[PDB]
Amino acid sequence: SGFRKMAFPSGKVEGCMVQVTCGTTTLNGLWLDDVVYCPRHVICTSEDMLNPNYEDLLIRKSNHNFLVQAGNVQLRVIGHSMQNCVLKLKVDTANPKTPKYKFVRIQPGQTFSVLACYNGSPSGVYQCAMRPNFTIKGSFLNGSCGSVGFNIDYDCVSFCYMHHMELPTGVHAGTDLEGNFYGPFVDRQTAQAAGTDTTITVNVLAWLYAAVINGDRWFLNRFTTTLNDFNLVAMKYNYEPLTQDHVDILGPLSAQTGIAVLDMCASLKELLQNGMNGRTILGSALLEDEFTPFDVVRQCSGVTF
Amino acid sequence: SGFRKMAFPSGKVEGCMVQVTCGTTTLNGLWLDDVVYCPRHVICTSEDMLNPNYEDLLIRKSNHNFLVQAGNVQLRVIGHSMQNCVLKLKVDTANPKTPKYKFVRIQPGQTFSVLACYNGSPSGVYQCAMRPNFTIKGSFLNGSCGSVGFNIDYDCVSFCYMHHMELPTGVHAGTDLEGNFYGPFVDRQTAQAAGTDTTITVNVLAWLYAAVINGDRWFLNRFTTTLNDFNLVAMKYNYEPLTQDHVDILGPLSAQTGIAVLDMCASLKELLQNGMNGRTILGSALLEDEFTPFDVVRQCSGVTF
Numbered sequence A, B: 001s002g003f004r005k006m007a008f009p010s011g012k013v014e015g016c017m018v019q020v021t022c023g024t025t026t027l028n029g030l031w032l033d034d035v036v037y038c039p040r041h042v043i044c045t046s047e048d049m050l051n052p053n054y055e056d057l058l059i060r061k062s063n064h065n066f067l068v069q070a071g072n073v074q075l076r077v078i079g080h081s082m083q084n085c086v087l088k089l090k091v092d093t094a095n096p097k098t099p100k101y102k103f104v105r106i107q108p109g110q111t112f113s114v115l116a117c118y119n120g121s122p123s124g125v126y127q128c129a130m131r132p133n134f135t136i137k138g139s140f141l142n143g144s145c146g147s148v149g150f151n152i153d154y155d156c157v158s159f160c161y162m163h164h165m166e167l168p169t170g171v172h173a174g175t176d177l178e179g180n181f182y183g184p185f186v187d188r189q190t191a192q193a194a195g196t197d198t199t200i201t202v203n204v205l206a207w208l209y210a211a212v213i214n215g216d217r218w219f220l221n222r223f224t225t226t227l228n229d230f231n232l233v234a235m236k237y238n239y240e241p242l243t244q245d246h247v248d249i250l251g252p253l254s255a256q257t258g259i260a261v262l263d264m265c266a267s268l269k270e271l272l273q274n275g276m277n278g279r280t281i282l283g284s285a286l287l288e289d290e291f292t293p294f295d296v297v298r299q300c301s302g303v304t305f
C-alpha cells in the first residue's frame, strides 16, 4: 500500500549523460550509439540568445569546437549536424552503455521521469507531466540544459524530452529528441508566455482511483453524472475536457474498484464545487494530475523493469 | 528555478539488487562485496509470521536453502548469519558493481531515496522521510521487502533503510542495514500501532525558504516570534519542537534569502493558525515536511554525484 510520485530507475540513462562544451557554454548531452544529442544553443554566447541565427552561428563551428566529455575521458567528434533545435555530434566511439531505446513525442497529459544533470553528471530524478500548455513544471538550474525526460517499458528507454529553456514565469520548455519544441516555444531569450495551465482531468480521475485502492474513500459521493454535464463543470474550473477515449483508458481502474468512471466523475465534480474542506487525499490537499491511468496501474501492480 | 521532490539517481543501487528465495518466500536482497543482506522473515511461511521464533526457524535452514539470483545467474551461498532482523548471506562472488558505500542509522526527520524493487528488479524511485514516529510513508506492495533507502554524497552510497513490514494503517516499518528496526516495530504480524505522526518543523521551514528562493513569497508576514512562543504553537498543531540546533541548520538558507529564521517561524505560525486560504506554496496546498535544509541547499545549488 501507499502511493508516491514515482520516477523510473535512472541507471540506464545515467550511463548516457555527457558534458558538452562549445566556446563559453557547457551543458549536458545524451550519448546513444555514436551520436551525442544536445541543445543547439550550446553554440551561443549569452548575448547571442537575445536574437540568435543558429545556421549563421554554426558556420563558425567545426567538429573540434565541441568538447564532449564522458567522466574524465574526451570523445572524438567526427561530424556534426543541426536537426531542428538539437545538435547531433557524431563521435569516434559508440557508447558501450547504450540501452535499448526509442525517441517518442508525447501528448499533453503524459508523464515521464527527468534525470536532472549538471556538467554531464546526474544530480537527481523526479516525475513530470507535459502540461496542456506544453510547458513542464521542472526543477532546472543553469547548466541543466540537455537533461532528458524518459519512460522505461522493460529494458527499453523511450526518450521524450530534452530540456532547453526556462520561461520568465519559472516553468520550462524543451524539445523531443528530434529537436522539435513542445508547443510554440523557441530557443531565444524573448518574451514567451505560457498559456492557461489547465488540469489534466483524466489523470485526476486516475489518481482518485489510486486513492480508493489505497483506502482513501471519504470523497466517494452518492451521485453520478454524464460526460456532457461533467464537462460543463470542467470548463468552469479550467479542467481539460473529458473524452470517451479517456473513459476507455480508465476502464481497468473502474474494473479494479467497482466504481463506474462517471460515478468518479461526479465525485470529482463535488470536490471541485465544494473543495476538500481541509481534508487530504493520498497525502495531498490538491487534486493531483501528474499520474496517468497507466502510472496508477503500474505502481499499484508492481510493474518492474 | 522550480522545486520538485527529487530522489537520488538510482543506478549505483540498481546494480546491487538481487532476488532472494527461501522455501516459499521471495523478496529482495542487497548485494555488496560478497554479502547479500535481506529481511530475515524470508525464512517464514505466511503462518510463521503470526508468532515467529527466528532462531528456531533458522535451525532448519542451510546455505543451499537460500536461492540468490542476480538477473538470470545464481550466486553460490557459502555462509549465512542472522544479525538482528537481517540475514547476511555470504556468496562466492563479490558484486563487481559494488559502489563505495556505508551503513548509517538516520534520525527522525532525515530524508532518503527508496528504490522499490520486486523479484530483484528495480521498479521505481521516490523520496521519503523517517517520520517522528519512526514509520515511513512509502509505496510498497507484497514482494517489495528488502528494497532499500539511501542517500548519495558523491560516489558514496549511504544505505539507511531496508523495507520489512506494512502496518495495518498502510504505513511502513523497516530496519537499518545492521538489522535494527527504526522505532519499536517488530517483524511479526501482530497489532502494532504507529504513534502520533507529527510534522517535521525544521523541514517545513526549509521548504518555506525554498519557496522564497523560487519566487513564492505571499506567505511572508510582518511578524517575528521567539523559539518559546513558536513552540507553544507547534505543540498545538502536532509539530515537532524547534531547537537551537535546528535554527543553526537553517542558517545558510536564512543567509541566502535575508529572512531571519525566527521571522520565517512567525510566517509559519500564521500559516498554521489561519491556513492557506486556498492558495498554494511551490505547487502544494499543504505544508510540506520531507525536504531537509540540506535537501533544499542541494536542489537549489545543483549539487551533483
Ligand SMILES: *CC(=O)Nc1cccc(N(C(=O)c2ccco2)[C@@H](C(=O)NCc2ccccc2)c2cccnc2)c1
Binding pocket: A025, A026, A027, A041, A042, A043, A044, A045, A046, A047, A049, A050, A141, A142, A143, A144, A145, A146, A163, A164, A165, A189
Ligand atoms: C538550461 C541551461 O543549462 N542554460 C544555460 C547554460 C549555460 C549558460 C546559460 N546562461 C547564463 O546566463 C548562465 C549564468 C550562469 C551560468 O549560465 C544563458 C543565458 O541566459 N543567456 C542569455 C541572457 C543571460 C542573462 C540576461 C539576459 C540574457 C546562456 C548562455 C550562453 C548560451 N546559452 C545560454 C544558460
Ligand SMILES: *CC(=O)Nc1cccc(N(C(=O)c2ccco2)[C@@H](C(=O)NCc2ccccc2)c2cccnc2)c1
Binding pocket: B025, B026, B027, B041, B042, B043, B044, B045, B046, B047, B049, B050, B141, B142, B143, B144, B145, B146, B163, B164, B165, B189
Ligand atoms: C514486504 C514483502 O515483500 N512482504 C512479503 C513477501 C512475500 C510474501 C508475503 N506475504 C503474503 O501474504 C503474500 C501474498 C501474496 C504475496 O505475498 C506475507 C504475509 O503477510 N504473511 C502473513 C499473513 C498473510 C495473510 C494474513 C495473515 C498473515 C509473508 C509470507 C511469508 C513470509 N513473510 C511474509 C509478504
